[PDB]
Design an enzyme around this catalytic site. Structure first.
Site, PDB file in Angstrom:
ATOM      1  CB  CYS A  17       7.016  18.086 -23.932  1.00  0.00           C
ATOM      2  SG  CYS A  17       5.271  18.373 -24.306  1.00  0.00           S
ATOM      3  CG  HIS A  58      -9.301  18.744 -15.821  1.00  0.00           C
ATOM      4  ND1 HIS A  58     -10.007  18.683 -16.977  1.00  0.00           N
ATOM      5  CD2 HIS A  58      -8.179  17.979 -16.008  1.00  0.00           C
ATOM      6  CE1 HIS A  58      -9.361  17.930 -17.850  1.00  0.00           C
ATOM      7  NE2 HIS A  58      -8.231  17.489 -17.293  1.00  0.00           N
ATOM      8  CB  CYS A  82     -11.652   9.912 -11.415  1.00  0.00           C
ATOM      9  SG  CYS A  82     -10.854  11.469 -11.804  1.00  0.00           S
ATOM     10  CB  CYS A  85     -13.056   5.322  -6.456  1.00  0.00           C
ATOM     11  SG  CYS A  85     -11.582   4.899  -5.485  1.00  0.00           S
ATOM     12  CG  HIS A  86     -15.771   8.257  -8.608  1.00  0.00           C
ATOM     13  ND1 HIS A  86     -16.729   8.377  -7.599  1.00  0.00           N
ATOM     14  CD2 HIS A  86     -14.785   9.067  -8.194  1.00  0.00           C
ATOM     15  CE1 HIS A  86     -16.232   9.123  -6.626  1.00  0.00           C
ATOM     16  NE2 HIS A  86     -15.002   9.569  -6.974  1.00  0.00           N
ATOM     17  CD  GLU A 156       2.302   7.912  -2.632  1.00  0.00           C
ATOM     18  OE1 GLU A 156       2.223   8.197  -1.423  1.00  0.00           O
ATOM     19  OE2 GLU A 156       1.865   6.811  -3.051  1.00  0.00           O
ATOM     20  N   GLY A 278       9.367   2.535  -2.631  1.00  0.00           N
ATOM     21  CA  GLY A 278      10.408   1.968  -1.763  1.00  0.00           C
ATOM     22  C   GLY A 278      10.312   0.468  -1.969  1.00  0.00           C
ATOM     23  CG  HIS A 365     -16.848   2.218   6.612  1.00  0.00           C
ATOM     24  ND1 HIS A 365     -18.133   2.520   6.546  1.00  0.00           N
ATOM     25  CD2 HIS A 365     -16.283   3.344   7.069  1.00  0.00           C
ATOM     26  CE1 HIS A 365     -18.371   3.724   6.981  1.00  0.00           C
ATOM     27  NE2 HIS A 365     -17.251   4.245   7.383  1.00  0.00           N
ATOM     28  CD  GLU A 378     -18.727   4.560  12.574  1.00  0.00           C
ATOM     29  OE1 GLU A 378     -18.631   3.605  11.770  1.00  0.00           O
ATOM     30  OE2 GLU A 378     -18.210   4.491  13.676  1.00  0.00           O
ATOM     31  NE  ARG A 381     -23.306   4.305  10.166  1.00  0.00           N
ATOM     32  CZ  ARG A 381     -22.255   3.653  10.711  1.00  0.00           C
ATOM     33  NH1 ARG A 381     -22.248   3.134  11.909  1.00  0.00           N
ATOM     34  NH2 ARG A 381     -21.119   3.530  10.026  1.00  0.00           N
ATOM     35  NE  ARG A 402     -16.094   2.648  11.489  1.00  0.00           N
ATOM     36  CZ  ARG A 402     -15.271   3.455  10.819  1.00  0.00           C
ATOM     37  NH1 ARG A 402     -14.091   2.960  10.451  1.00  0.00           N
ATOM     38  NH2 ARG A 402     -15.644   4.700  10.503  1.00  0.00           N
ATOM     39  CG  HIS A 504     -12.763   1.443   6.077  1.00  0.00           C
ATOM     40  ND1 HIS A 504     -12.724   2.546   5.195  1.00  0.00           N
ATOM     41  CD2 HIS A 504     -12.621   1.926   7.297  1.00  0.00           C
ATOM     42  CE1 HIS A 504     -12.670   3.639   5.966  1.00  0.00           C
ATOM     43  NE2 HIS A 504     -12.562   3.301   7.227  1.00  0.00           N
ATOM     44  CG  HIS A 505      -7.964   0.519   9.189  1.00  0.00           C
ATOM     45  ND1 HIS A 505      -7.436   1.796   9.051  1.00  0.00           N
ATOM     46  CD2 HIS A 505      -7.289  -0.030  10.217  1.00  0.00           C
ATOM     47  CE1 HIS A 505      -6.404   1.974   9.879  1.00  0.00           C
ATOM     48  NE2 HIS A 505      -6.325   0.910  10.628  1.00  0.00           N
ATOM     49  NE  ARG A 544      -9.039   2.332  11.681  1.00  0.00           N
ATOM     50  CZ  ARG A 544      -9.880   3.250  11.235  1.00  0.00           C
ATOM     51  NH1 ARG A 544     -10.396   4.247  11.994  1.00  0.00           N
ATOM     52  NH2 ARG A 544     -10.313   3.226  10.016  1.00  0.00           N
ATOM     53  N   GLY A 547     -12.431   7.365  13.584  1.00  0.00           N
ATOM     54  CA  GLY A 547     -11.782   8.522  14.225  1.00  0.00           C
ATOM     55  C   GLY A 547     -10.351   8.137  14.688  1.00  0.00           C
TER      56      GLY A 547
HETATM   57  C1  LIG Z   1     -12.409   6.259   2.354  1.00  0.00           C
HETATM   58  C2  LIG Z   1     -11.750   6.390   3.698  1.00  0.00           C
HETATM   59  C3  LIG Z   1     -12.080   7.335   4.643  1.00  0.00           C
HETATM   60  C4  LIG Z   1     -11.483   7.238   5.974  1.00  0.00           C
HETATM   61  N1  LIG Z   1     -11.982   8.101   6.935  1.00  0.00           N
HETATM   62  C5  LIG Z   1     -11.340   8.137   8.070  1.00  0.00           C
HETATM   63  C6  LIG Z   1     -11.679   9.157   9.104  1.00  0.00           C
HETATM   64  O1  LIG Z   1     -12.479   9.999   9.030  1.00  0.00           O
HETATM   65  N2  LIG Z   1     -11.077   8.979  10.366  1.00  0.00           N
HETATM   66  C7  LIG Z   1     -10.135   7.943  10.523  1.00  0.00           C
HETATM   67  O2  LIG Z   1      -9.677   7.806  11.621  1.00  0.00           O
HETATM   68  N3  LIG Z   1      -9.710   7.103   9.510  1.00  0.00           N
HETATM   69  C8  LIG Z   1     -10.347   7.164   8.413  1.00  0.00           C
HETATM   70  N4  LIG Z   1      -9.944   6.202   7.523  1.00  0.00           N
HETATM   71  C9  LIG Z   1      -8.669   5.501   7.782  1.00  0.00           C
HETATM   72  C10 LIG Z   1      -7.479   6.383   7.538  1.00  0.00           C
HETATM   73  O3  LIG Z   1      -7.646   7.430   6.511  1.00  0.00           O
HETATM   74  C11 LIG Z   1      -6.250   5.475   7.030  1.00  0.00           C
HETATM   75  O4  LIG Z   1      -6.139   4.538   8.154  1.00  0.00           O
HETATM   76  C12 LIG Z   1      -4.883   6.290   7.018  1.00  0.00           C
HETATM   77  O5  LIG Z   1      -5.064   6.904   5.715  1.00  0.00           O
HETATM   78  C13 LIG Z   1      -3.601   5.501   7.249  1.00  0.00           C
HETATM   79  O6  LIG Z   1      -2.711   6.562   6.950  1.00  0.00           O
HETATM   80  P1  LIG Z   1      -1.127   6.257   6.633  1.00  0.00           P
HETATM   81  O7  LIG Z   1      -0.320   7.403   6.544  1.00  0.00           O
HETATM   82  O8  LIG Z   1      -0.819   5.189   7.579  1.00  0.00           O
HETATM   83  O9  LIG Z   1      -1.399   5.574   5.169  1.00  0.00           O
HETATM   84  P2  LIG Z   1      -2.068   6.205   3.863  1.00  0.00           P
HETATM   85  O10 LIG Z   1      -2.672   7.504   4.132  1.00  0.00           O
HETATM   86  O11 LIG Z   1      -2.886   5.120   3.253  1.00  0.00           O
HETATM   87  O12 LIG Z   1      -0.769   6.459   2.961  1.00  0.00           O
HETATM   88  C14 LIG Z   1       0.305   5.555   2.704  1.00  0.00           C
HETATM   89  C15 LIG Z   1       1.016   6.043   1.439  1.00  0.00           C
HETATM   90  O13 LIG Z   1       2.124   5.138   1.185  1.00  0.00           O
HETATM   91  C16 LIG Z   1       2.227   4.945  -0.197  1.00  0.00           C
HETATM   92  N5  LIG Z   1       3.006   3.721  -0.380  1.00  0.00           N
HETATM   93  C17 LIG Z   1       2.601   2.401  -0.192  1.00  0.00           C
HETATM   94  N6  LIG Z   1       3.515   1.519  -0.400  1.00  0.00           N
HETATM   95  C18 LIG Z   1       4.638   2.239  -0.744  1.00  0.00           C
HETATM   96  C19 LIG Z   1       5.909   1.928  -1.205  1.00  0.00           C
HETATM   97  N7  LIG Z   1       6.451   0.703  -1.220  1.00  0.00           N
HETATM   98  N8  LIG Z   1       6.663   2.955  -1.670  1.00  0.00           N
HETATM   99  C20 LIG Z   1       6.255   4.217  -1.630  1.00  0.00           C
HETATM  100  N9  LIG Z   1       4.987   4.647  -1.246  1.00  0.00           N
HETATM  101  C21 LIG Z   1       4.288   3.572  -0.783  1.00  0.00           C
HETATM  102  C22 LIG Z   1       0.704   4.607  -0.473  1.00  0.00           C
HETATM  103  O14 LIG Z   1       0.602   4.795  -1.888  1.00  0.00           O
HETATM  104  C23 LIG Z   1       0.068   5.834   0.223  1.00  0.00           C
HETATM  105  O15 LIG Z   1      -0.003   6.972  -0.595  1.00  0.00           O
HETATM  106  C24 LIG Z   1     -10.452   6.291   6.242  1.00  0.00           C
HETATM  107  C25 LIG Z   1      -9.921   5.480   5.205  1.00  0.00           C
HETATM  108  C26 LIG Z   1     -10.601   5.516   3.953  1.00  0.00           C
HETATM  109  C27 LIG Z   1     -10.197   4.519   2.886  1.00  0.00           C
HETATM  110  C1  HEM Z   2       2.460  16.232 -21.154  1.00  0.00           C
HETATM  111  C2  HEM Z   2       2.186  17.460 -21.558  1.00  0.00           C
HETATM  112  C3  HEM Z   2       0.805  17.895 -22.066  1.00  0.00           C
HETATM  113  C4  HEM Z   2      -0.382  17.304 -21.887  1.00  0.00           C
HETATM  114  C5  HEM Z   2      -0.744  16.086 -21.027  1.00  0.00           C
HETATM  115  C6  HEM Z   2      -1.348  18.059 -22.646  1.00  0.00           C
HETATM  116  C7  HEM Z   2      -2.685  17.788 -22.725  1.00  0.00           C
HETATM  117  C8  HEM Z   2      -3.309  17.909 -23.945  1.00  0.00           C
HETATM  118  C9  HEM Z   2      -4.378  17.066 -24.403  1.00  0.00           C
HETATM  119  C10 HEM Z   2      -4.970  15.930 -23.544  1.00  0.00           C
HETATM  120  C11 HEM Z   2      -4.765  17.509 -25.603  1.00  0.00           C
HETATM  121  C12 HEM Z   2      -5.892  16.951 -26.500  1.00  0.00           C
HETATM  122  C13 HEM Z   2      -5.473  15.822 -27.448  1.00  0.00           C
HETATM  123  C14 HEM Z   2      -6.494  15.544 -28.521  1.00  0.00           C
HETATM  124  O1  HEM Z   2      -7.396  16.419 -28.553  1.00  0.00           O
HETATM  125  O2  HEM Z   2      -6.380  14.533 -29.238  1.00  0.00           O
HETATM  126  C15 HEM Z   2      -3.945  18.646 -25.936  1.00  0.00           C
HETATM  127  C16 HEM Z   2      -3.985  19.406 -27.106  1.00  0.00           C
HETATM  128  C17 HEM Z   2      -3.259  20.576 -27.297  1.00  0.00           C
HETATM  129  N1  HEM Z   2      -2.112  20.881 -26.592  1.00  0.00           N
HETATM  130 FE1  HEM Z   2      -1.274  19.779 -25.139  1.00  0.00          FE
HETATM  131  N2  HEM Z   2      -0.723  19.118 -23.285  1.00  0.00           N
HETATM  132  C18 HEM Z   2       0.614  19.033 -22.925  1.00  0.00           C
HETATM  133  C19 HEM Z   2       1.580  19.925 -23.363  1.00  0.00           C
HETATM  134  C20 HEM Z   2       1.365  20.925 -24.297  1.00  0.00           C
HETATM  135  C21 HEM Z   2       2.363  21.833 -24.814  1.00  0.00           C
HETATM  136  C22 HEM Z   2       3.841  21.840 -24.344  1.00  0.00           C
HETATM  137  C23 HEM Z   2       1.759  22.627 -25.709  1.00  0.00           C
HETATM  138  C24 HEM Z   2       2.322  23.730 -26.620  1.00  0.00           C
HETATM  139  C25 HEM Z   2       3.578  23.992 -26.923  1.00  0.00           C
HETATM  140  C26 HEM Z   2       0.368  22.229 -25.773  1.00  0.00           C
HETATM  141  C27 HEM Z   2      -0.575  22.788 -26.590  1.00  0.00           C
HETATM  142  C28 HEM Z   2      -1.673  22.115 -27.037  1.00  0.00           C
HETATM  143  C29 HEM Z   2      -2.542  22.561 -28.106  1.00  0.00           C
HETATM  144  C30 HEM Z   2      -2.315  23.896 -28.857  1.00  0.00           C
HETATM  145  C31 HEM Z   2      -3.489  21.631 -28.269  1.00  0.00           C
HETATM  146  C32 HEM Z   2      -4.666  21.667 -29.267  1.00  0.00           C
HETATM  147  C33 HEM Z   2      -5.802  22.622 -28.985  1.00  0.00           C
HETATM  148  C34 HEM Z   2      -5.625  23.911 -28.240  1.00  0.00           C
HETATM  149  O3  HEM Z   2      -5.515  23.870 -26.967  1.00  0.00           O
HETATM  150  O4  HEM Z   2      -5.626  24.996 -28.920  1.00  0.00           O
HETATM  151  N3  HEM Z   2       0.140  21.178 -24.907  1.00  0.00           N
HETATM  152  N4  HEM Z   2      -3.017  18.826 -24.915  1.00  0.00           N
HETATM  153  O1  LIG Z   3     -16.642   7.025   8.380  1.00  0.00           O
HETATM  154  C1  LIG Z   3     -15.664   7.746   8.300  1.00  0.00           C
HETATM  155  O2  LIG Z   3     -15.639   8.936   8.097  1.00  0.00           O
HETATM  156  C2  LIG Z   3     -14.357   6.864   8.496  1.00  0.00           C
HETATM  157  O3  LIG Z   3     -14.109   5.987   7.558  1.00  0.00           O
HETATM  158  C3  LIG Z   3     -13.808   6.899   9.767  1.00  0.00           C
HETATM  159  C4  LIG Z   3     -12.867   6.028  10.181  1.00  0.00           C
HETATM  160  O4  LIG Z   3     -12.197   6.007  11.327  1.00  0.00           O
HETATM  161  O5  LIG Z   3     -12.450   4.790   9.442  1.00  0.00           O
HETATM  162 NA    NA Z   4      -2.527  -1.819  10.590  1.00  0.00          NA
END
Ligand SMILES: Cc1cc2nc3c(=O)[nH]c(=O)nc-3n(C[C@H](O)[C@H](O)[C@H](O)COP(=O)(O)OP(=O)(O)OC[C@H]3O[C@@H](n4cnc5c(N)ncnc54)[C@H](O)[C@@H]3O)c2cc1C
Ligand code: HEM
Ligand SMILES: O=C([O-])[C@H](O)C=C([O-])O
Ligand code: NA
Ligand code: HEM
Ligand code: HEM
Ligand code: HEM
EC number: 1.3.2.4
Length: 568
Positions: A17, A58, A82, A85-86, A156, A278, A365, A378, A381, A402, A504-505, A544, A547
């Site tokens: 690694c 993935h 993930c 949000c989910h 970032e 930053g 929103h 939006e 709609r 909005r 949202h904003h 706002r 768009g």
């Molecule tokens: C779900 C969703 C959908 C949207 N859909 C739309 C759309 O269709 N049309 C529209 O007009 N707008 C939309 N909006 C609004 C729009 O996407 C956001 O207003 C826009 O992303 C602002 O962009 P930005 O570059 O200013 O910031 P962002 O894209 O939010 O990015 C800022 C980046 O700065 C990084 N950061 C923050 N603090 C620091 C720090 N101290 N050091 C280093 N990195 C830092 C944050 O992690 C982030 O990755 C949406 C927003 C959302 C949440």
């Molecule tokens: C940060 C680096 C890596 C991540 C995040 C990763 C991810 C993973 C994860 C999540 C598992 C499963 C753990 C479990 O089942 O308990 C796994 C297993 C495994 N990893 Fe890693 N991997 C990494 C690097 C590597 C490297 C460098 C190697 C080989 C030299 C490797 C080979 C394998 C193998 C052989 C297995 C077991 C099953 C298989 O794929 O045959 N991985 N890995």
């Molecule tokens: O509804 C969208 O797609 C969205 O979220 C748009 C803006 O501008 O904020």
């Molecule tokens: Na602002």
């Protein structure tokens, strides 16, 4: 085996690694994720072995190359990104439950021994421009400053790029583009300006709005000039005509735009550092910028010397505590935003002298999916969906502003409402396929059966769509005066999406001027320091327009990088 490295040490050596000295390659863990990919394959290859019919850990929409270490840490248990949000059913080996707890800039005040030492060392790099934040404004700014002959470092704090920008759906407002020309739309930047200004309630700073409108075609021409598709022009609330651009057939504008900017930074070899926050803008003895201190999650504190620092950190709509202080009516609401959209980037700005404005203006929103906890564009709609309450009736002009839609929806029974549409609408906007895919769009072949599935009065709803549909035909909505009635809902099956407002904003933020220069409480420029995107106030005023933030980040991002690169 309590952790993944432990689990892997079992039958493998440390240097499968790590690099030969064993020091971490950088805060992006480049070398170390490469090792992962040499044994498990790339992201796509791994999703091929992780399939689930409706989700895949993935897979997703995230643009750029998404490190394995965004979720798999080696020597400690870690979290699935993930889950911010989910709630997909996950079995991550070495998981721990999503929890974001990031110190605030002020808390990082405790690190004065490390900070002082970093500051007493030499700069780790020396460049002309540091751009903070990898959303839409940050990439654009890096690109335009590189292309203006500046050397850039782009940082970032998250593990992944794109901020909120990669989530964008409905579109990018531009006027009097060729793209509206080809679709037979007729608009002027005066009209985009006057939609904007009225939409913001005349609170907007007119010169920033003037830049937004006057540069919007140019911004769209810029992106298109770079690889983007923004030919689909759709309607959004509070616009006079259609002008929300997004890719051909209605797909989400956000992931795409961030993936074109990302390839454009890569094409130019832009130095992009992930897990790098930053922390402090540094100033010389005549108060102009001289660099920034940053905090690498993996290698620690260090500073970069530069002439100009571009803050493109986005808003603070994920931070309900700060939102609730400013707007108590939002306290408790779910947010649509990425997990790091908390306003640290503003604190950085203030600490450097920048003054804030319009901070109490926070947009909710109108249609977050009650079910999925994700925003429903939006554009659903704008492409013709209506809203209905639990009584099966319309209650608002769905393409209004909005503030007004949100209020309408909160006043409906059970504080939510339903998007209702047919296949004609679904077919016009591919993003809907995404909500159908998420499972948030119940469907049926009649409105009685859908209302019955969903708890809406069936016959009322049926009678509602048939009045709507005559209103479409006769071209005037005399019930709620929705000015654009683009489609009858009468083709194929029907769908409902339960919706309610989510945070949202933030329209307020750092005070900038037309050159994207941050100013102070006396309105004086801070030499070397710029602001672009949602981190700024003055552009969208009190409300706002859907768009406009994407058009905002592209236009201010781009101008900030040119102003910074010329400044030097
Ligand atoms: C779900 C969703 C959908 C949207 N859909 C739309 C759309 O269709 N049309 C529209 O007009 N707008 C939309 N909006 C609004 C729009 O996407 C956001 O207003 C826009 O992303 C602002 O962009 P930005 O570059 O200013 O910031 P962002 O894209 O939010 O990015 C800022 C980046 O700065 C990084 N950061 C923050 N603090 C620091 C720090 N101290 N050091 C280093 N990195 C830092 C944050 O992690 C982030 O990755 C949406 C927003 C959302 C949440
Ligand atoms: C940060 C680096 C890596 C991540 C995040 C990763 C991810 C993973 C994860 C999540 C598992 C499963 C753990 C479990 O089942 O308990 C796994 C297993 C495994 N990893 Fe890693 N991997 C990494 C690097 C590597 C490297 C460098 C190697 C080989 C030299 C490797 C080979 C394998 C193998 C052989 C297995 C077991 C099953 C298989 O794929 O045959 N991985 N890995
Ligand atoms: O509804 C969208 O797609 C969205 O979220 C748009 C803006 O501008 O904020
Ligand atoms: Na602002
Ligand atoms: C006994 C074997 C190992 C030793 C002694 C070792 C050493 C270290 C050290 C000292 C750190 C912290 C670095 C710092 O803070 O500067 C670290 C982190 C890291 N190591 Fe290891 N390493 C070993 C095995 C592995 C394995 C098996 C993997 C992956 C499967 C791995 C991948 C990583 C990664 C990706 C990080 C960054 C942080 C994290 O995810 O925990 N190393 N390692
Ligand atoms: C090339 C990049 C990555 C590699 C090599 C890697 C490695 C692995 C492996 C080998 C497994 C076990 C699956 C199996 O054995 O069938 C796994 C599972 C998992 N990984 Fe990754 N991973 C990577 C990227 C990511 C990312 C970016 C995330 C989160 C956004 C993530 C989250 C998960 C989760 C949640 C599981 C459990 C699966 C489930 O319940 O469906 N991984 N990973
Ligand atoms: C690897 C990480 C993630 C995966 C695999 C994932 C998976 C999905 C899935 C399966 C859907 C249903 C539609 C489809 O087929 O694309 C979806 C939609 C959605 N997800 Fe995620 N999710 C992830 C992370 C996130 C995060 C972190 C956020 C918010 C910051 C988010 C916000 C949304 C939204 C707003 C939608 C609605 C459809 C759209 O806008 O395109 N997701 N995602």
């Amino acid at each position: 085996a309590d952790n993944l490295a432990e689990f892997h040490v079992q039958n493998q050596e440390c240097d499968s690694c790590h690099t030969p000295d064993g020091e971490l390659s950088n805060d992006s863990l480049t070398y170390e994720n490469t090792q992962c990919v040499s044994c498990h394959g790339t992201l796509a290859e791994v999703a091929e072995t992780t399939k689930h019919e409706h989700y895949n850990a993935h897979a997703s929409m995230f643009p750029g190359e998404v490190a394995c270490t965004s979720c798999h840490s080696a020597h400690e248990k870690s979290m699935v990104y993930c889950d911010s949000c989910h709630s997909f059913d996950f079995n991550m080996p070495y998981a721990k439950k999503w929890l974001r707890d990031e110190p605030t800039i002020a808390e990082l005040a405790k690190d004065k021994s490390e900070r002082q030492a970093a500051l007493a060392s030499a700069p780790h790099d020396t460049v002309d421009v540091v751009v903070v934040g990898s959303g839409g404004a940050g990439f654009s700014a890096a690109i335009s400053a590189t292309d203006s002959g500046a050397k850039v470092i782009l940082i970032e704090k998250e593990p992944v790029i794109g901020g909120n920008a990669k989530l964008a759906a409905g579109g990018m407002n531009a006027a009097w583009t060729d793209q509206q020309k080809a679709k037979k739309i007729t608009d002027s930047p005066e009209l985009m300006f006057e939609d904007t200004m009225k939409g913001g309630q005349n609170i907007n700073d007119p010169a920033l709005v003037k830049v937004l409108s006057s540069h919007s075609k140019d911004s769209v021409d810029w992106m298109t000039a770079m690889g983007a598709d923004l030919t689909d022009v759709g309607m959004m609330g509070g616009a006079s005509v259609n002008r929300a651009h997004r890719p051909t057939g209605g797909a989400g504008v956000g992931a795409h735009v961030v993936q074109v900017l990302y390839d454009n930074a890569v094409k130019r070899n832009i130095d992009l550092r992930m897990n790098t926050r930053g922390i402090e803008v540094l100033k010389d003895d005549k108060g102009t910028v001289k660099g920034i201190l940053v905090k690498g999650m993996y290698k620690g504190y260090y500073w970069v010397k530069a002439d100009a620092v571009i803050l493109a950190t986005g808003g603070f709509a994920k931070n309900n505590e700060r939102v609730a202080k400013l707007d108590p009516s939002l306290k408790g609401f779910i947010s649509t935003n990425q997990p790091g959209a908390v306003g640290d980037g503003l604190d950085v700005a203030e600490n450097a002298g920048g003054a804030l404005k319009d901070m109490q203006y926070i947009q909710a929103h109108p249609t977050l999916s009650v079910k999925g906890g994700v925003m429903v564009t939006e554009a659903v709609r704008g492409n013709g969906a209506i809203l209905v309450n639990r009584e099966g009736k319309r209650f608002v002009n769905e393409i209004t502003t909005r503030d007004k839609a949100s209020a309408a929806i909160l006043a409906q029974t059970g504080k939510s409402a339903y998007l209702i549409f047919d296949d004609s609408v679904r077919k016009s906007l591919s993003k809907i396929d995404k909500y159908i895919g998420l499972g948030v769009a119940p469907t049926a072949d009649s409105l009685v059966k859908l209302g019955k599935m969903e708890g809406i009065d069936g016959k009322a709803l049926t009678e509602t769509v048939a009045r709507y549909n005559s209103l479409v035909s006769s071209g005037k909505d005399t019930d709620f005066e929705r000015p654009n009635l683009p489609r009858a809902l009468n083709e194929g099956n029907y769908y409902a999406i339960e919706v309610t407002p989510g945070v949202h904003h933030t329209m307020g933020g750092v005070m900038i001027d037309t050159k994207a220069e941050v100013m102070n409480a006396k309105k004086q420029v801070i030499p070397g320091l710029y602001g672009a995107g949602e981190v700024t106030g003055g552009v969208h005023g009190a409300n706002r327009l859907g768009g406009n933030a994407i058009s905002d980040i592209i236009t201010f991002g781009r101008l900030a990088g040119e102003e910074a690169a010329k400044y030097s």
